[PDB]
Amino acid sequence: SMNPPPPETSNPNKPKRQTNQLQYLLRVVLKTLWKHQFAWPFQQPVDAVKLNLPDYYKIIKTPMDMGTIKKRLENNYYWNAQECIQDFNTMFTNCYIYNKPGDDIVLMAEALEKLFLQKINELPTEE
Numbered sequence: 001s002m003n004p005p006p007p008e009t010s011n012p013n014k015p016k017r018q019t020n021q022l023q024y025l026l027r028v029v030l031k032t033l034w035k036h037q038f039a040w041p042f043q044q045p046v047d048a049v050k051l052n053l054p055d056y057y058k059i060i061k062t063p064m065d066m067g068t069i070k071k072r073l074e075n076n077y078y079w080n081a082q083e084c085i086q087d088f089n090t091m092f093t094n095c096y097i098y099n100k101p102g103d104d105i106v107l108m109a110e111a112l113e114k115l116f117l118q119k120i121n122e123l124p125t126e127e
């Protein structure tokens with residue numbers, strides 16, 4: 001089962017703006033998570049062909065990954081921090097939906113999510 005096209009990272013029809021919270025999401029949240037030892041499965045779209053997971057995109061219909069999020073942030077795709085936080089949450093939820101408790105990938109997601117939430121807990125006051 002073939003890979004779908006990746007999620008968009010630009011869209012001229014979508015409104016957007018720069019906010020101090022979005023800057024933090026790139027400079028602090030994304031850039032820190034990227035360096036975590038367990039980041040790598042989440043740095044690009046899942047390659048379900050290479051992994052021989054032909055049902056991955058049968059089950060995950062709203063895929064999301066940190067490579068996509070990074071590009072969206074660099075490309076000023078978002079209107080607000082909540083939109084970006086939603087993409088991270090989609091990424092984590094997708095992992096917990098597809099995999100079994102106790103799977104290595106779930107342990108990895110959980111560690112990354114712990115760090116994410118620590119960073120979001122310090123999200124600066126808006127504007």
Ligand SMILES: Cc1cnc(Nc2ccc(N3CCN(C)CC3)c(F)c2)nc1Nc1cccc(NS(=O)(=O)C(C)(C)C)c1
Pocket residue numbers: 040041042043044045046047048050051052053094095098099105
């Ligand atoms: C984000 C995520 C969510 N859920 C999974 N699940 C999952 C399930 C089963 C297996 N394996 C596959 C091989 N097979 C023999 C045994 C079962 C499995 F490997 C993973 N995996 C995720 N990410 C990931 C993990 C590893 C490797 C890459 N590599 S990649 O090519 O996609 C890359 C380098 C482009 C990120 C991604």
